[PDB]
């Protein structure tokens, strides 16, 4: 608080803190009040906070279907060395987990997937076009209110929230991070594509395709399926930046996934290449034989 919004339920706590939920009194709609702390410099609002938030508002005027809208923003608490900024948001009713959990399907469908994915890539390709790249691409940060929609969420935010690790938290659900995201810290756009195939698989029809914990543990977990790349496909440089220790080979896709189609295997492979360059494009994917 405070804001010309009246909260209710509390749809989540996680990385971006508590994500409570409110109504818009003089609009009569639902709103997802998130929030963040930033430092009150001697030069006022963090230059990088004003710029980042500002850009997220430079989007609501595209009205793109498969992305959520930053509806409003408010810097509430000023105090020497800290300002609190509530990010008012568009409010979906449920997420991709609550979607795949309330799952009637025993394994299927595929046209509730092929569309649903060809959709997912859309919002991603948009956000990318505008130079936005997502960190926490997850079933938490994917959603649909009803009628099927797929409004991507918590986009960009990573930059705005750099001040979070002054709490050094929290969940760190590193199930989806790219082979670079914590083998280094590249924060490239392709790393945002990796997280796609990890959701692409998890949809058939279970739980995380690579959930573990340790950076290297997941890194090795990953090699199990794809196969350890020989050089020169091997980078640097820091943060227990292990070289090749456990030596492995290329394992079939449909193997541990029941069960990808002719292409569904081959595409998820293009998606999940190790080398971010010969990876796949957010768009070129969005028009593969798999459609």
């Amino acid at each position: 608080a405070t804001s010309r919004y009246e909260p209710v339920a509390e749809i989540g706590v996680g990385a971006y803190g508590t994500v409570y939920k409110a109504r818009d009194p003089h609009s009569g709609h639902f709103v997802a009040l998130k929030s963040v702390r930033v430092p009150n410099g001697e030069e006022g609002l963090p230059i990088s906070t004003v710029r980042e938030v500002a850009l997220l508002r430079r989007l609501e005027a595209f009205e793109h279907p498969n992305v959520v809208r930053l509806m409003d923003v408010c810097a509430t608490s000023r105090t020497d060395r800290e300002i609190k900024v509530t990010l008012v948001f568009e409010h979906v009713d449920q997420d991709l987990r609550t979607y795949l959990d309330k799952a009637p399907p025993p394994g299927l469908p595929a046209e509730t997937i092929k569309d649903l994915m060809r959709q997912f890539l859309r919002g991603l390709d948009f956000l990318h076009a505008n130079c936005i790249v997502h960190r926490d691409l997850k079933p938490e940060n994917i959603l649909v209110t009803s009628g099927g929609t797929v409004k991507l969420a918590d986009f960009g935010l990573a930059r705005i929230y750099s001040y979070q690790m002054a709490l050094a938290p929290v969940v760190v659900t590193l199930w989806y991070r790219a082979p670079e995201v914590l083998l280094q810290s590249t924060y490239a756009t392709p790393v945002d594509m990796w997280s796609v195939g990890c959701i692409f698989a998890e949809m058939f029809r279970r739980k995380p395709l690579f959930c573990g914990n340790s950076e290297a543990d997941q890194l090795g977990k990953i090699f199990d399926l794809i196969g350890l790349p020989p050089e020169d496909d091997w980078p640097r440089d820091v943060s227990l930046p292990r070289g090749a220790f456990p030596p492995r080979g290329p394992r079939p896709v449909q193997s541990v996934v029941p069960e990808m189609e002719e292409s569904g295997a081959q595409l998820l492979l293009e998606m999940l290449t190790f080398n971010p360059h010969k990876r796949i494009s957010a768009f070129r994917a969005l028009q593969h034989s798999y459609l």
């Binding site: 030069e43 006022g44 005027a61 810097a75």
Partner: protein
Amino acid sequence: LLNDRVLRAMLKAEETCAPSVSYFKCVQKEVLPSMRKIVATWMLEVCEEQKCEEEVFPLAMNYLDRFLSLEPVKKSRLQLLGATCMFVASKMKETIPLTAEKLCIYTDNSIRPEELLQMELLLVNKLKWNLAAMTPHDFIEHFLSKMPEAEENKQIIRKHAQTFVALCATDVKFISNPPSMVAAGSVVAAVQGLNLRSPNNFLSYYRLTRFLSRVIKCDPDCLRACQEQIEALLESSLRQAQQNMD
């Protein structure tokens, strides 16, 4: 192409940042157009003196008009608003943003950093952090890309247009007309006045009104009206440029 898709979006966003042409009547009590004239021209000198990125000034004026559209303000507190709008405009557009202290220096330290920073949240919050707004310059470049003119020529057009845009920004016109119009009217006045001095050269002038209004999707009489308004503003600089004595 992506010309239209972006341009379409530019125009949408343009309308989400539009001020009220009525704010002096409806919102403001103390503040009058002549005072805004003084702050705008004060802001322009700062941007010039400080060699700011040229899109800073017209961006701050947008902020100022959209705020006066939302908040009543004591005249004593207008200059402070000018300052803040530049503070945020600069932070948005500059690799080396203006300093709050450097800004107050320009008021002869009439205002203070602490005040400035209180305003920044005022301003930013009133505008709902919708600050990556459009400027006339954003459109000028666009129109310029669509035009068959040698880079040498586009440089001169670009120069003159941005003069006009500044003229407009210190005028109430800027409140009535969105940057798209302001950009087109300025390009139209620029290219046309260049076609005169150098006939058979800036021949993009030829029915440029209809052309640019075809792009903006606007009544070409408004662009004609706008163009004239600008051409007059320019003349009114005949007065200022000389009377500095008494």
